Structures are given as structure tokens and as C-alpha cells.
């Protein structure tokens, strides 16, 4: 087993509806499946899309979880992704901040 490296995907409004921003976490290079992701300890569920993992040439998996939030919230609300990789007994809580 290998636990993931988790990186923040800082918010961007380029691709979202007006007045919203997409932010996320990149869950890189773990094995085996699965990883679970929540946001703000399960309190944030609206606008969350956790994508199916990719299997890479290395034989390791990566996935991303993205949440679309109001742009007005970026200064006022902390966003943390809670990543759990049970097979490696790894948990990461990654704060995702504006750049």
C-alpha cells in the first residue's frame, strides 16, 4: 500500500457560473483503491464533485475532488478537504486557500 499526497487546488471562477468559484483537492499517487473525500468534516456537501480515480502507468491511482462555492465566501469561509485512505491508514485534512 501507498498513501496519497494531497495538494490544494486554489479557487478559480473561470469555468463556473457567475458569482461562484471552483476549488478542490488533488489526491495523488495512492494504492490500492479506495480513497474517500469529504469537505469541512461532512458539513459541506452542496456543489461537491469527487471524480473517479485514474490508474496511471506507475500502477498508482490519483483522483480529484472539486467544490463550487459562492465567490463571496472565499474570504469568510475556511474550506478543508478530508481525505481518507484506509488501506494505508492515512488521513489528510488539507486547507484550500485563495492564491
Amino acid at each position: 500500500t501507498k498513501g496519497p499526497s494531497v495538494f490544494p487546488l486554489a479557487p478559480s471562477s473561470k469555468s463556473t457560473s457567475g458569482g461562484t468559484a471552483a476549488l478542490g483537492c488533488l489526491v495523488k499517487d495512492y494504492f490500492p483503491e479506495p480513497v474517500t473525500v469529504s469537505w469541512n468534516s461532512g458539513a459541506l456537501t452542496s456543489g461537491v464533485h469527487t471524480f473517479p480515480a485514474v490508474l496511471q502507468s506507475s500502477g498508482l491511482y490519483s483522483l480529484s475532488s472539486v467544490v463550487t462555492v459562492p465567490s463571496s465566501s472565499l474570504g469568510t469561509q475556511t474550506y478543508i478537504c478530508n481525505v481518507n485512505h484506509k488501506p494505508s491508514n492515512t488521513k489528510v485534512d488539507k486547507k484550500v486557500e485563495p492564491k
Binding site: 495538494f7 490544494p8 487546488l9 478559480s12 469555468s15 488533488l26 495523488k28 464533485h49 485514474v54 490519483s62
Partner: protein, 101 residues
């Protein structure tokens, strides 16, 4: 079922990942139908396939499809170009997002 065009979100490498001497571009593709897309990545204008890993599209809860594509680079590769692009082709139409260091 009617054709639905993909929404594409592209994230550059995080500063944190760069500090770990790694870099990953993340191209997220959602809400398309039918469930076949192709992805092309470019460093500036030059197509690249090394380091590209793309999922097979899977059905979302709304009967449309999602996919993701990743381009794994060295920090030096990332910083050496003016930009990188993720180009998603679906049913003969393309959506291209570009990010820069």
C-alpha cells in the same frame, strides 16, 4: 438522449506541489453526453502525450458523463513554457483551457 457539451475546469500545479519537486495539471470534464471524449494536451502549441493519464468516462448521477485528465510534469518543464492547455474534443467540438506559471 440529446447531446450535452462538456464543462471543463483546468487547475495548474499548486505552489505546494512544486515545493515537493512535482507538478500536476488537472483537467476536469463534466456533464457530457454521449460518453466519449478525447483529450489533447499542449505545452505552448506543441502536443504532448508523455505524463498524460485520462480516465474512461463514467456516468454521473444525472445520466451524463464525467472524466478527468492529468498531466504530470517536472517543475522545470512547467516553468519552461509560457502556458499549457487541455483541449477536450466531444462530438467534433472542442473546449480548450489554458494556464500559465
Amino acid at each position: 438522449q440529446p447531446k450535452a457539451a462538456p464543462s471543463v475546469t483546468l487547475f495548474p500545479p499548486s505552489s505546494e506541489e512544486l515545493q515537493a519537486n512535482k507538478a500536476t495539471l488537472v483537467c476536469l470534464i463534466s456533464d457530457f453526453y454521449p460518453g466519449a471524449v478525447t483529450v489533447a494536451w499542449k505545452a505552448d502549441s506543441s502536443p504532448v502525450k508523455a505524463g498524460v493519464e485520462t480516465t474512461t468516462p463514467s456516468k454521473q448521477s444525472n445520466n451524463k458523463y464525467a472524466a478527468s485528465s492529468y498531466l504530470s510534469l517536472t517543475p522545470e518543464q512547467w516553468k519552461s513554457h509560457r502556458s499549457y492547455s487541455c483541449q477536450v474534443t466531444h462530438e467534433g467540438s472542442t473546449v480548450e483551457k489554458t494556464v500559465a506559471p
